[PDB]
Amino acid sequence: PEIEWWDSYIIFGITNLVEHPAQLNPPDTPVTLGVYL
Amino acid sequence: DVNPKAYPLADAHLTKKLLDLVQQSCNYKQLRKGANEATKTLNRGISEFIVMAADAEPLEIILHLPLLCEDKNVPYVFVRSKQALGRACGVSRPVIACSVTIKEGSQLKQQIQSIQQSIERLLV
Amino acid sequence: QTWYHEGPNSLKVARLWIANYSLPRAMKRLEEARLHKEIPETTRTSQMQELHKSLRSLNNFCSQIGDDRPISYCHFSPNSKMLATACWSGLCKLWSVPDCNLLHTLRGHNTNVGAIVFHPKSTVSLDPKDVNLASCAADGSVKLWSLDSDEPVADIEGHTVRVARVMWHPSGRFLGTTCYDRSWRLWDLEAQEEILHQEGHSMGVYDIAFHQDGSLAGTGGLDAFGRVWDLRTGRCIMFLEGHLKEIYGINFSPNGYHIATGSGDNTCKVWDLRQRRCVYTIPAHQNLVTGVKFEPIHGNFLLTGAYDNTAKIWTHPGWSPLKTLAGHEGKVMGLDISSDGQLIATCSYDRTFKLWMAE
Amino acid sequence: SQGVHISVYRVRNLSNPAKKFKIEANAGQLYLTGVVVLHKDVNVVVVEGGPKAQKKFKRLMLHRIKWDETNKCVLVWEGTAKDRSFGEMKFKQCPTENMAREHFKKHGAEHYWDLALSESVLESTD
Amino acid sequence: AVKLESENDEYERARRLLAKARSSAPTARVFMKSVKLEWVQDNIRAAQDLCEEALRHYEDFPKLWMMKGQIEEQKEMMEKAREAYNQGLKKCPHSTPLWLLLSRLEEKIGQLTRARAILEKSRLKNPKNPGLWLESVRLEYRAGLKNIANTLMAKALQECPNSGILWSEAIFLEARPQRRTKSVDALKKCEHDPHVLLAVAKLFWSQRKITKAREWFHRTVKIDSDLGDAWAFFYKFELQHGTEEQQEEVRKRCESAEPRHGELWCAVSKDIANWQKKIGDILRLVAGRIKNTF
């Protein structure tokens, strides 16, 4: 490997922008707490 | 859900399992209600583990129990409400701490071991 | 939809600095990798066999109790002469190596300290008065410590939720902090501000790791998804999809192309940045893996530790078990490897940290 | 639904059809997927399913089956995975080790073979 | 025959009988007896040569390894004794007849952190829920912090809870201005006398309750077992108490307690006394009992 993929993409694309990329659900009905007597 | 000093705060599914196990232990006469009884069971090592509610208005009145569990190697968590723990303990009054205790040859062995293994895995 | 935050000019100058610092190290790593390739296969095999014998000879040289409360993290100094142990009681302790004598007791944290990390140039080219250590506790404070003062030099406020892990950037100018607010933050020492507030995780971010070149940062989250971020561009490059439960340890190999992430599924998955895929899934332990760390210089072996009271050493790229470090009565909460690679520190819930050395 | 609990076990000698049937029948009744790879000194029993079924089957193999009939069962690993790897319980008599490795590579779980074989060589050194 | 010759008209006759027995091609037991005889009253070189001969005959003998370590430590050569102990532990492991000795040597000769590491390694290698936890607490933890010792005792009671030694260590070393009677009652649930009832007697004597302490000590000494430490403690408590005549009767009934009383030497030497230092001239036992116990 002459250069890594991140380095190859980099070498100029740097700017002042921070992303919020594709929030994914971790791998809708709450468990109702059955109250005893 | 509010106070972070109650660190081992269980989730909903584990809360259901834990309250169910507390109900069974009360049925089997293996439960000690109250913080004072939990402390007395700690000092004798006759306790499998301890459940405590994270809703005591002074919460630090039950933070000596984790520090004693560390000295006696006893699992411990926090549950979200005092009334749910009280009802799970067979007591209409709000219980803020209960202790599930040891008994040789009991039928609640496997459930207690599983709930312990789950308990000492969420502590971080 | 991926929202983009218009960062301040401090972010711009910091990212230009990151690029200018990371490019030469990237070329240096590439040249070192080439030089390693030119080495004959017989010599490499002999060195690997010697390292495997040394790791099989690993045994518990010293076992010292840290504090009356369990130890959460242990970190070696860059010179492998000092050991920093963070405790849940709020105290941090600096011990000598290998005599394990208590040298310093940093105080100022009121809650459970989660991690303490040495500055990358500490005890090497930095004065002891300067900021040499960074610690975080359950109250969210991030405190910086020198070596001549038991008192904190400064405190980094800004996190209202517990800070999980704190890691120095390889430059040491930048500090990455993980918070349960699902976001992680990069701060500057020179400007004393949070350069980069980065969300993206659906759940809390537990662990953060930095690429040795300094260009990439790996963040493990409680959402069972790890994310690789390019600091210069602020864009996530790779998502380490494949883990079931909360990721508790993320580490970059010194080779700069393998990433190891241990999860609550008791497995440690190794991924390739270049191929953008998982290369292996080690069924490491019977319990959740607390920390994953490569050998800092060459990365010949991978160290794991879990709640099964054991650590394990795995070959690289072999991924075969070499030695099972056992002897801790409590759960191994933190682990570290010396810069020279001869010493391995494991701090446990039994309130003791044990040193392992090769016979 | 939530996630598959897996355990891998190593058995030295698994040649008796009675215990083979016991494992098959109790895995089928407990609705536990997985497979058994039979090889010299390395008998890999991989079982996938639910936590309570895994607990029952673990007690089966570690506290109900007498293995000295030396030959013994050693727990190798227990964990969780998102998806199952196999369907119904299947036996594979592999004359060699590379054939079993290829079979496990078919589903992408070769690290099970890795752990089992490495533990076997480690216990043979002892 | 060697034992008879030890009490016979000549100890040189006992040495000659031991040499003749060694000339009869015996097993390692007679070899250890001969090594102890050379270690009874003679130069350390003879004992070292006997140990070398035993190793050239059979190296799988914990008694021989312990004798070699004790011989190497007799000349204050702690490094050679430690090396021999480590080699014996690696080659011929046991439960804890020598691991405790290695830990004690490491704590005395050198830093105690290495001794604690050795104790942890022994408790993790082949524990089988042993009584070495008391050694890891009393000989190691009791000499340092107190809370760490309490936690170690709690853990040692969590595993193998019916252990008499662990219960006695936790009873008399937790606290006895208070919370001691509760510990005594808890230990009484695991009813036995591995110095467990002797712990109750000691607690009663601490409270200056002469009648109850005397009754408990008599019950534990007369018929619980034929022990040495308990009998010696009862004799000391009787002499301290205002009998001055029952002390002589207790001493007579303890010296003449079941003349198969090597058990009373299997507990006095395993708790207080030693072998071949003052026991070698107690009455007769120099050659056999030294190699028998460790």
PDB file of N, CA and C in Angstrom, chain B residues 78-121:
ATOM      1  N   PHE B  78     -29.279   0.221  41.731  1.00  0.00           N
ATOM      2  CA  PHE B  78     -30.301   1.186  42.099  1.00  0.00           C
ATOM      3  C   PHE B  78     -31.503   1.015  41.184  1.00  0.00           C
ATOM      4  N   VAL B  79     -32.697   1.092  41.760  1.00  0.00           N
ATOM      5  CA  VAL B  79     -33.932   1.102  40.992  1.00  0.00           C
ATOM      6  C   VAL B  79     -34.518   2.510  41.037  1.00  0.00           C
ATOM      7  N   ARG B  80     -35.443   2.778  40.120  1.00  0.00           N
ATOM      8  CA  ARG B  80     -35.875   4.144  39.858  1.00  0.00           C
ATOM      9  C   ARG B  80     -36.811   4.719  40.913  1.00  0.00           C
ATOM     10  N   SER B  81     -37.661   3.906  41.538  1.00  0.00           N
ATOM     11  CA  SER B  81     -38.669   4.433  42.448  1.00  0.00           C
ATOM     12  C   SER B  81     -38.718   3.610  43.727  1.00  0.00           C
ATOM     13  N   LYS B  82     -39.049   4.289  44.827  1.00  0.00           N
ATOM     14  CA  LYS B  82     -39.158   3.629  46.123  1.00  0.00           C
ATOM     15  C   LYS B  82     -40.446   2.828  46.260  1.00  0.00           C
ATOM     16  N   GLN B  83     -41.552   3.326  45.704  1.00  0.00           N
ATOM     17  CA  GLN B  83     -42.824   2.630  45.842  1.00  0.00           C
ATOM     18  C   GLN B  83     -42.840   1.303  45.100  1.00  0.00           C
ATOM     19  N   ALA B  84     -42.228   1.235  43.917  1.00  0.00           N
ATOM     20  CA  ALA B  84     -42.152  -0.039  43.213  1.00  0.00           C
ATOM     21  C   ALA B  84     -41.365  -1.066  44.010  1.00  0.00           C
ATOM     22  N   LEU B  85     -40.245  -0.655  44.609  1.00  0.00           N
ATOM     23  CA  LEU B  85     -39.493  -1.561  45.466  1.00  0.00           C
ATOM     24  C   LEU B  85     -40.309  -1.987  46.677  1.00  0.00           C
ATOM     25  N   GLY B  86     -41.051  -1.059  47.281  1.00  0.00           N
ATOM     26  CA  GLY B  86     -41.876  -1.421  48.421  1.00  0.00           C
ATOM     27  C   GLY B  86     -42.935  -2.446  48.065  1.00  0.00           C
ATOM     28  N   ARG B  87     -43.648  -2.218  46.960  1.00  0.00           N
ATOM     29  CA  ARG B  87     -44.658  -3.177  46.523  1.00  0.00           C
ATOM     30  C   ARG B  87     -44.033  -4.518  46.170  1.00  0.00           C
ATOM     31  N   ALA B  88     -42.863  -4.505  45.532  1.00  0.00           N
ATOM     32  CA  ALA B  88     -42.179  -5.753  45.218  1.00  0.00           C
ATOM     33  C   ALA B  88     -41.768  -6.501  46.478  1.00  0.00           C
ATOM     34  N   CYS B  89     -41.627  -5.793  47.596  1.00  0.00           N
ATOM     35  CA  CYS B  89     -41.221  -6.383  48.861  1.00  0.00           C
ATOM     36  C   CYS B  89     -42.403  -6.832  49.711  1.00  0.00           C
ATOM     37  N   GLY B  90     -43.623  -6.739  49.189  1.00  0.00           N
ATOM     38  CA  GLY B  90     -44.797  -7.086  49.964  1.00  0.00           C
ATOM     39  C   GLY B  90     -45.188  -6.065  51.002  1.00  0.00           C
ATOM     40  N   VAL B  91     -44.742  -4.821  50.856  1.00  0.00           N
ATOM     41  CA  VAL B  91     -44.978  -3.774  51.840  1.00  0.00           C
ATOM     42  C   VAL B  91     -45.607  -2.587  51.127  1.00  0.00           C
ATOM     43  N   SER B  92     -46.768  -2.146  51.610  1.00  0.00           N
ATOM     44  CA  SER B  92     -47.414  -0.981  51.020  1.00  0.00           C
ATOM     45  C   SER B  92     -46.608   0.292  51.228  1.00  0.00           C
ATOM     46  N   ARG B  93     -45.870   0.390  52.324  1.00  0.00           N
ATOM     47  CA  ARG B  93     -45.037   1.552  52.575  1.00  0.00           C
ATOM     48  C   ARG B  93     -43.829   1.561  51.644  1.00  0.00           C
ATOM     49  N   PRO B  94     -43.355   2.742  51.261  1.00  0.00           N
ATOM     50  CA  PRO B  94     -42.193   2.814  50.370  1.00  0.00           C
ATOM     51  C   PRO B  94     -40.927   2.272  51.010  1.00  0.00           C
ATOM     52  N   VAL B  95     -40.402   1.188  50.453  1.00  0.00           N
ATOM     53  CA  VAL B  95     -39.132   0.619  50.882  1.00  0.00           C
ATOM     54  C   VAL B  95     -38.036   1.165  49.982  1.00  0.00           C
ATOM     55  N   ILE B  96     -36.954   1.651  50.586  1.00  0.00           N
ATOM     56  CA  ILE B  96     -35.844   2.225  49.831  1.00  0.00           C
ATOM     57  C   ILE B  96     -34.650   1.293  49.731  1.00  0.00           C
ATOM     58  N   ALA B  97     -34.654   0.167  50.436  1.00  0.00           N
ATOM     59  CA  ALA B  97     -33.553  -0.779  50.345  1.00  0.00           C
ATOM     60  C   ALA B  97     -34.028  -2.138  50.835  1.00  0.00           C
ATOM     61  N   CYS B  98     -33.683  -3.180  50.085  1.00  0.00           N
ATOM     62  CA  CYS B  98     -33.994  -4.548  50.459  1.00  0.00           C
ATOM     63  C   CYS B  98     -32.787  -5.416  50.152  1.00  0.00           C
ATOM     64  N   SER B  99     -32.675  -6.516  50.887  1.00  0.00           N
ATOM     65  CA  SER B  99     -31.567  -7.445  50.736  1.00  0.00           C
ATOM     66  C   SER B  99     -32.101  -8.838  50.446  1.00  0.00           C
ATOM     67  N   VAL B 100     -31.650  -9.423  49.341  1.00  0.00           N
ATOM     68  CA  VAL B 100     -31.918 -10.822  49.038  1.00  0.00           C
ATOM     69  C   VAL B 100     -30.786 -11.650  49.625  1.00  0.00           C
ATOM     70  N   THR B 101     -31.146 -12.599  50.484  1.00  0.00           N
ATOM     71  CA  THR B 101     -30.224 -13.268  51.386  1.00  0.00           C
ATOM     72  C   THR B 101     -29.958 -14.703  50.949  1.00  0.00           C
ATOM     73  N   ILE B 102     -28.900 -15.275  51.518  1.00  0.00           N
ATOM     74  CA  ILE B 102     -28.497 -16.639  51.196  1.00  0.00           C
ATOM     75  C   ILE B 102     -29.345 -17.624  51.987  1.00  0.00           C
ATOM     76  N   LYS B 103     -29.539 -18.810  51.417  1.00  0.00           N
ATOM     77  CA  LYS B 103     -30.149 -19.938  52.103  1.00  0.00           C
ATOM     78  C   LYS B 103     -29.666 -21.207  51.424  1.00  0.00           C
ATOM     79  N   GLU B 104     -29.043 -22.090  52.198  1.00  0.00           N
ATOM     80  CA  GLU B 104     -28.457 -23.295  51.632  1.00  0.00           C
ATOM     81  C   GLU B 104     -29.542 -24.217  51.090  1.00  0.00           C
ATOM     82  N   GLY B 105     -29.299 -24.768  49.903  1.00  0.00           N
ATOM     83  CA  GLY B 105     -30.247 -25.686  49.305  1.00  0.00           C
ATOM     84  C   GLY B 105     -31.530 -25.052  48.826  1.00  0.00           C
ATOM     85  N   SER B 106     -31.517 -23.754  48.539  1.00  0.00           N
ATOM     86  CA  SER B 106     -32.724 -23.071  48.104  1.00  0.00           C
ATOM     87  C   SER B 106     -33.024 -23.373  46.639  1.00  0.00           C
ATOM     88  N   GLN B 107     -34.275 -23.124  46.254  1.00  0.00           N
ATOM     89  CA  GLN B 107     -34.695 -23.300  44.871  1.00  0.00           C
ATOM     90  C   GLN B 107     -34.434 -22.071  44.013  1.00  0.00           C
ATOM     91  N   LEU B 108     -34.091 -20.935  44.621  1.00  0.00           N
ATOM     92  CA  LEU B 108     -33.815 -19.707  43.887  1.00  0.00           C
ATOM     93  C   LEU B 108     -32.338 -19.539  43.560  1.00  0.00           C
ATOM     94  N   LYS B 109     -31.588 -20.639  43.474  1.00  0.00           N
ATOM     95  CA  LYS B 109     -30.161 -20.539  43.188  1.00  0.00           C
ATOM     96  C   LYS B 109     -29.910 -19.914  41.822  1.00  0.00           C
ATOM     97  N   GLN B 110     -30.392 -20.563  40.758  1.00  0.00           N
ATOM     98  CA  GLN B 110     -30.018 -20.163  39.404  1.00  0.00           C
ATOM     99  C   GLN B 110     -30.473 -18.746  39.081  1.00  0.00           C
ATOM    100  N   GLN B 111     -31.687 -18.373  39.495  1.00  0.00           N
ATOM    101  CA  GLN B 111     -32.161 -17.019  39.228  1.00  0.00           C
ATOM    102  C   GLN B 111     -31.292 -15.982  39.928  1.00  0.00           C
ATOM    103  N   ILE B 112     -30.896 -16.255  41.172  1.00  0.00           N
ATOM    104  CA  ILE B 112     -30.032 -15.326  41.892  1.00  0.00           C
ATOM    105  C   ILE B 112     -28.665 -15.230  41.227  1.00  0.00           C
ATOM    106  N   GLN B 113     -28.093 -16.363  40.812  1.00  0.00           N
ATOM    107  CA  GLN B 113     -26.797 -16.311  40.137  1.00  0.00           C
ATOM    108  C   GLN B 113     -26.880 -15.527  38.833  1.00  0.00           C
ATOM    109  N   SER B 114     -27.939 -15.742  38.051  1.00  0.00           N
ATOM    110  CA  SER B 114     -28.086 -15.012  36.796  1.00  0.00           C
ATOM    111  C   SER B 114     -28.272 -13.521  37.042  1.00  0.00           C
ATOM    112  N   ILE B 115     -29.092 -13.159  38.029  1.00  0.00           N
ATOM    113  CA  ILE B 115     -29.316 -11.748  38.317  1.00  0.00           C
ATOM    114  C   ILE B 115     -28.044 -11.108  38.854  1.00  0.00           C
ATOM    115  N   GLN B 116     -27.231 -11.870  39.589  1.00  0.00           N
ATOM    116  CA  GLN B 116     -25.938 -11.354  40.013  1.00  0.00           C
ATOM    117  C   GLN B 116     -25.031 -11.107  38.819  1.00  0.00           C
ATOM    118  N   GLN B 117     -24.865 -12.112  37.954  1.00  0.00           N
ATOM    119  CA  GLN B 117     -24.002 -11.962  36.787  1.00  0.00           C
ATOM    120  C   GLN B 117     -24.424 -10.771  35.940  1.00  0.00           C
ATOM    121  N   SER B 118     -25.733 -10.576  35.768  1.00  0.00           N
ATOM    122  CA  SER B 118     -26.203  -9.374  35.090  1.00  0.00           C
ATOM    123  C   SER B 118     -25.880  -8.120  35.892  1.00  0.00           C
ATOM    124  N   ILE B 119     -25.943  -8.205  37.221  1.00  0.00           N
ATOM    125  CA  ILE B 119     -25.774  -7.022  38.059  1.00  0.00           C
ATOM    126  C   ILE B 119     -24.324  -6.554  38.041  1.00  0.00           C
ATOM    127  N   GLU B 120     -23.378  -7.482  38.219  1.00  0.00           N
ATOM    128  CA  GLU B 120     -21.966  -7.122  38.255  1.00  0.00           C
ATOM    129  C   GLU B 120     -21.371  -6.968  36.865  1.00  0.00           C
ATOM    130  N   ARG B 121     -22.220  -6.763  35.861  1.00  0.00           N
ATOM    131  CA  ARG B 121     -21.794  -6.488  34.503  1.00  0.00           C
ATOM    132  C   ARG B 121     -22.222  -5.109  34.025  1.00  0.00           C
TER     133      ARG B 121
END
